[PDB]
């Protein structure tokens, strides 16, 4: 049995609003809307959270029953679709410990892990993998290129209790190594371990909005995340491109 710490597919209309909390740290955060977009694999399945306002900060998050990854594997997975042809805007998630106030979450709130694609002009086309360690948020020393097209892509981070990690895009490995080698933490066997995870958050800036996020999964099972990804992103992809191609 895989431990399913968090799953979000937005399959039940407006009920997501009971699961996700808007921060009030700023009064002028942009709004997320539930949408499948202009083109999609399936109208119902491909509903997800869409940024709806240009040049805005975004702060929305969802709690789950707290857990620690000590002694086990951690997998964070979601899909990102920059349907708008983005110029500049984030597409990454943050995982927060139990202490976070969801009503006051912002860019500088303390987080454990930040993972996902970031785009800001041609210079920044990066997959972030950031670990909080000894009071610092440490960025991976490797260049992982993010996808920049209009289509749905799957992002997966795997963190294992032997201090190894793996990044997959579209369910295929793009980067791999050990935590000791690929970040400047600098023989600590417990770097990977955090005492709690309790909230997943979207803390973004976007110029051109319209990004859609879907199919969030936090789990301890690599094989399951891979299956879920094929059942999810893997079914979206071909039908989505078909519909877009139809659209001259
Ligand atoms: O990038 C590592 C960093 O990420 C997290 O913090 C994010 C930043 O605080 C910021 O993201 C940047 C923002 O940049 C632009 C705009 O706001 C600036 O004023 C402008 C001036 O140079 O440049 C950009 O236009 O957005 C872009 C697009 O996503 C990012 O690439 C920039 O990094 O704001 C976001 C949203 O609040 C933060 O998530 C982590 O919190 C931090 O620890 C980490 O080091
Ligand atoms: Ca969905």
Swiss-Prot record:
Residues bearing PTM N6-(2-hydroxyisobutyryl)lysine:
47
Per the record, the domain comment is: Can be divided into a N-terminal globular domain, a proline-rich P-domain forming an elongated arm-like structure and a C-terminal acidic domain. The P-domain binds one molecule of calcium with high affinity, whereas the acidic C-domain binds multiple calcium ions with low affinity.
* The keyword Disulfide bond belongs to this UniProt entry's keyword annotation: yes
Swiss-Prot/TrEMBL sequence repeat ranges = 174-185
Which residues does the annotation say bind Ca(2+)? Answer: 9, 45, 47, 214
Residues bearing N6-acetyllysine are 31, 142
List every stretch annotated N-domain.
1-180
| Protein residues bound to an alpha-D-glucoside | 92, 94, 111, 118, 203
What the record says about family reads:
Belongs to the calreticulin family.
The primary location reported for this protein is endoplasmic reticulum
Question: According to its UniProt record, where is this protein located?
Answer: Endoplasmic reticulum lumen; Cytoplasm, Cytosol; Cytolytic granule; Secreted, Extracellular space, Extracellular matrix
Q: What does this protein do?
A: Calcium-binding chaperone that promotes folding, oligomeric assembly and quality control in the endoplasmic reticulum (ER) via the calreticulin/calnexin cycle. This lectin interacts transiently with almost all of the monoglucosylated glycoproteins that are synthesized in the ER. Interacts with the DNA-binding domain of NR3C1 and mediates its nuclear export. Involved in maternal gene expression regulation. May participate in oocyte maturation via the regulation of calcium homeostasis.
Gene it is expressed from: Calr
Subunit (UniProt) = Monomer. Interacts with GABARAP, NR3C1, PDIA3/ERp57 and TRIM21. Interacts (via P-domain) with PDIA5. Interacts with PPIB. Interacts with SPACA9. Component of an EIF2 complex at least composed of CELF1/CUGBP1, CALR, CALR3, EIF2S1, EIF2S2, HSP90B1 and HSPA5. Interacts with CLCC1.
Q: Does the keyword Transport apply?
A: no
Q: Name one GO biological process term.
A: response to peptide
Q: What is this protein called?
A: Calreticulin
What keywords are annotated for this sequence in UniProt? Acetylation, Calcium, Chaperone, Cytoplasm, Cytoplasmic vesicle, Disulfide bond, Endoplasmic reticulum, Extracellular matrix, Hydroxylation, Lectin, Lysosome, Metal-binding, Repeat, Sarcoplasmic reticulum, Secreted, Signal, Zinc
């Amino acid at each position: 049995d895989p431990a399913i710490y968090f799953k979000e597919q937005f399959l039940d209309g407006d009920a997501w609003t009971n699961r996700w909390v808007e921060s009030k740290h700023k009064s002028d955060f942009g709004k997320f809307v539930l949408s499948s977009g202009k083109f999609y694999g399936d109208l119902e399945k491909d509903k997800g959270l869409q940024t709806s306002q240009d040049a805005r900060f975004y702060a929305l998050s969802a709690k789950f029953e707290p857990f620690s990854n000590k002694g086990q594997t951690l997998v964070v997975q979601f899909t990102v679709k920059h349907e708008q042809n983005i110029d500049c805007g984030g597409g990454y998630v943050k995982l927060f410990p139990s202490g976070l106030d969801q009503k006051d979450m912002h860019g500088d709130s303390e987080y454990n892990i930040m993972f996902g694609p970031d785009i800001c002009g041609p210079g920044t086309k990066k997959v972030h993998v950031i670990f909080n360690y000894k009071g610092k948020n440490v960025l991976i020393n490797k260049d992982i290129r993010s996808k920049d097209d209009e289509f749905t892509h799957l992002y997966t981070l795997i963190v294992r209790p032997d201090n190894t990690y793996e990044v997959k895009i579209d369910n295929s490995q793009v980067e791999s190594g050990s935590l000791e080698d690929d970040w400047d933490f600098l023989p600590d066997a417990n770097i990977y371990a955090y005492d709690s995870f309790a909230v997943l958050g979207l803390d973004l800036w976007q110029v051109k909005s319209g990004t859609i996020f879907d199919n969030f999964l936090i789990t301890n099972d690599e094989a399951y995340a891979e299956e879920f990804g094929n059942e999810t992103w893997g079914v979206t992809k071909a039908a989505e491109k078909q519909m877009k191609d139809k659209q001259d």
